[PDB]
């Protein structure tokens, strides 16, 4: 039955990325912004290799990201959709049923502005999934998800439109 309780779409995780191009104080302030927003200590990502054009070097701490789950993830997601005034594009949805958008200023979310911190843009990505994804993530007896239980673009688009009364453009 397509109308089963366990087939309910719901958010798996929200990942917040700030890819400041350098290392040092600026990256530290982006991490402070992320720890402020999520309430959890974020983690810093190192460059996989060196590019002179981008001014980065291998193992230089470049970006910072954090993963939030549960009600806090829901609150942050709607706080960010308010800034986007609830209007994404069709191209914002991946073939695997996940979606994302990118804000440009972190004070638009609704947090206090500090001259020392400055303003950072931010990247939002939401990982969608039904119940039973633990099959693919548990240690013992890991398996794959059946095709009907898989998350795809159309179901995620319809679920987002229904749950948020928002519009999914396609320009």
């Amino acid at each position: 039955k397509s109308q089963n309780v366990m087939r309910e779409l719901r958010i798996e995780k929200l990942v917040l990325n700030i890819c400041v191009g350098e290392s040092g104080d600026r990256l530290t302030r982006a991490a402070k912004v992320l720890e402020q927003l999520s309430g959890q200590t974020p983690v810093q990502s190192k460059a996989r290799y060196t590019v002179r054009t981008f001014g980065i070097r291998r193992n230089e701490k470049i970006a910072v990201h954090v993963t939030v789950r549960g009600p806090k993830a829901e609150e942050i997601l709607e706080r960010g959709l308010k800034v986007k005034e609830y209007q994404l594009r069709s191209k914002n949805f991946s073939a695997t049923g996940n979606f994302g958008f990118g804000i440009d200023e972190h004070i638009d979310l609704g947090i206090k502005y500090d001259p020392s911190i400055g303003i950072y843009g931010m990247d939002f990505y939401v990982v969608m999934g039904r119940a039973g994804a633990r099959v693919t993530r548990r240690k013992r007896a890991r398996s794959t998800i059946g095709n009907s239980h898989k998350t795809n673009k159309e179901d995620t688009i319809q679920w987002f439109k229904t749950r948020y009364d928002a519009e999914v453009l396609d320009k």
Binding site: P42, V43, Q44, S45, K46, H65
Partner: peptide
């Protein structure tokens, strides 16, 4: 605090293929 760990093995990369200009 905490930082991402190297899941990959391209130790002596320092650059990547496919990354060709004019492409």
């Amino acid at each position: 605090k905490n930082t991402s760990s190297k899941k990959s093995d391209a130790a002596p990369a320092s650059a990547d293929p496919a990354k060709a200009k004019k492409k």
